[PDB]
Point group: C3
Chain length 199, copies 3
Amino acid sequence: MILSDKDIIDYVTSKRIIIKPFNKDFVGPCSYDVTLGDEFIIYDDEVYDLSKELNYKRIKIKNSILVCPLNYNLTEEKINYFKEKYNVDYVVEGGVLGTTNEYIELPNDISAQYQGRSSLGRVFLTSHQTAGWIDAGFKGKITLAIVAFDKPVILYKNQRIGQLIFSKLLSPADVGYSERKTSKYAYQKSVMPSLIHLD
Amino acid sequence: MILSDKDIIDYVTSKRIIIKPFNKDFVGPCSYDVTLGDEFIIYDDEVYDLSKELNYKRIKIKNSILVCPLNYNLTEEKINYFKEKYNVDYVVEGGVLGTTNEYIELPNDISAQYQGRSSLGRVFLTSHQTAGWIDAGFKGKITLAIVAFDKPVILYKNQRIGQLIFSKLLSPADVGYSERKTSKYAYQKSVMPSLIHLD
Amino acid sequence: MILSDKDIIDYVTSKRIIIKPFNKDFVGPCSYDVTLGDEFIIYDDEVYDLSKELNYKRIKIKNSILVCPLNYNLTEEKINYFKEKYNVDYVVEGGVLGTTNEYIELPNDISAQYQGRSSLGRVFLTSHQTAGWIDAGFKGKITLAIVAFDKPVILYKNQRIGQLIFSKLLSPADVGYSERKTSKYAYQKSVMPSLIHLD
Ligand SMILES: O=c1ccn([C@H]2C[C@H](O)[C@@H](COP(=O)(O)NP(=O)(O)OP(=O)(O)O)O2)c(=O)[nH]1
Ligand SMILES: O=c1ccn([C@H]2C[C@H](O)[C@@H](COP(=O)(O)NP(=O)(O)OP(=O)(O)O)O2)c(=O)[nH]1
Ligand SMILES: O=c1ccn([C@H]2C[C@H](O)[C@@H](COP(=O)(O)NP(=O)(O)OP(=O)(O)O)O2)c(=O)[nH]1
Ligand SMILES: [Mg+2]
Ligand SMILES: [Mg+2]
Ligand SMILES: [Mg+2]
């Protein structure tokens, strides 16, 4: 049971789903188009040891970022070359965390899957790493995990990067995501790293 | 609300969902198995600059194609070696775009997720890059974005590559995908590159 | 139509969905959290020729495994270095097959999508390769296809790796997965390689 344009528009109209900011032009037949924020995270450790707290760097782009596939083997020279040639603000290799501009709130009877736009998929750019499931009760922005798999990709601030596909629950959740004490990522105001060391 | 074998068969029987060509043997408990077309696209530019129109090459296989992981570092020699050893028609590295044989039409009250078969997943071969969501109202073949993540994979023309998982909308869409002026990929007769420069 | 915590708990309570072993603490708003088994598979051939039967190796971890991105270029020296530094049992590069601890049974009117936890997604670790769709009627453990896309990741035996998102069918399947003669992966007791050579 998937929400259509009118269901989305009506659930928003009714304040039952929150989407801040909202643009009705981004409502498609059965999904809401979300946009890429200007804040990104890259991690800094040799390995991800999930028992530990992770070191990372935050960047804020002005207009654009070049995302290279892992093992592109970026030298300082290559970075400067790409910045000069393509006028991008940052060049990164492998995984970068991003965020939607949109802050969302889901009722205990709606769920969402975040999925990338096919336009991005068609250039081998992914925006979640087998994740994108948004629980009933969730409140926050959505953290994107971005990897290029063919060639470097230029992504622009505020571009449409993916889509929320909402679905009705059979029965509502007893305790929605944001009501749980265990929840790591509620009230997510920006791009947020992994907190798995809290398990 | 996911369609089962009988729902799929009945929606097809009723002409409410179109699947051309259709083979009832490919209907599973809750998905329709789709097959790999003979047309592929590979892109040709240094970076994907999504503000621009992209350069690419089209190939048509006779029987098979070898898909190597990115940074396999294919020399002309290695290519010739694989063609001789495995009798494949093309050898490619990183991302290749493919297409289903099947042309489909969805009513304004059905949606689909394209997903790969676990048999392919189990050899680390993907056939969409965080995409695969098919809108209510969509008409066309389905464009596959294919990447190998462990070792090179031989894919054969007309093999079963993935599956459509159909789902009911709560209310139908006011305007289905193919009725929208904005829609980039309606009436898709083959493998189609990214048209994101049209945003 | 997605099952919530109470739907899951009630379907389990009613024996209509089987989950062995079951921990009610792992029931979230709208998904059941699954755990990583100690058995893994790595394949051994130059290419995956899907017309053929595949060679592979089985490992059983005691506590942990380091999963490196493909083309990390692991020497014996690097392996020994990581084992000494991080006290992991195995170091692997590219794709490794894993399994859930949980054996599950689905009725002919329930379907599931396996998806990774965002905590793992946020470190660019995937646990299925465009797959994760569990058919109505399926009986078995779930085979995970695991790839790291940024930096090596330490995964621990019995950790929570992903989640089952169950959904109601519109009508039940005439023949569920485990009732079909064609089915490759029914009664799956561990991690299982690709049987696509049986098509
Ligand atoms: O992986 C996919 C995904 C979608 N499609 C088809 C079905 C879908 O209805 C259509 C567009 O899907 P998206 O909306 O996810 N792509 P995008 O947003 O770039 O195109 P548009 O601006 O036309 O919506 O393309 C494919 O062929 N392959
Ligand atoms: O990622 C997955 C996906 C599915 N499965 C299980 C559940 C599902 O019912 C079963 C088969 O799924 P697919 O139909 O997607 N695989 P395939 O088409 O290759 O096998 P078959 O020919 O048996 O349908 O394997 C896993 O263990 N891991
Ligand atoms: O890709 C995603 C997925 C989820 N999310 C949000 C929505 C979801 O409700 C929340 C947690 O999702 P998961 O349960 O899949 N992550 P995890 O299990 O690691 O966190 P927790 O222990 O809090 O459930 O994070 C993102 O921002 N990006
Ligand atoms: Mg779209
Ligand atoms: Mg199948
Ligand atoms: Mg969770």
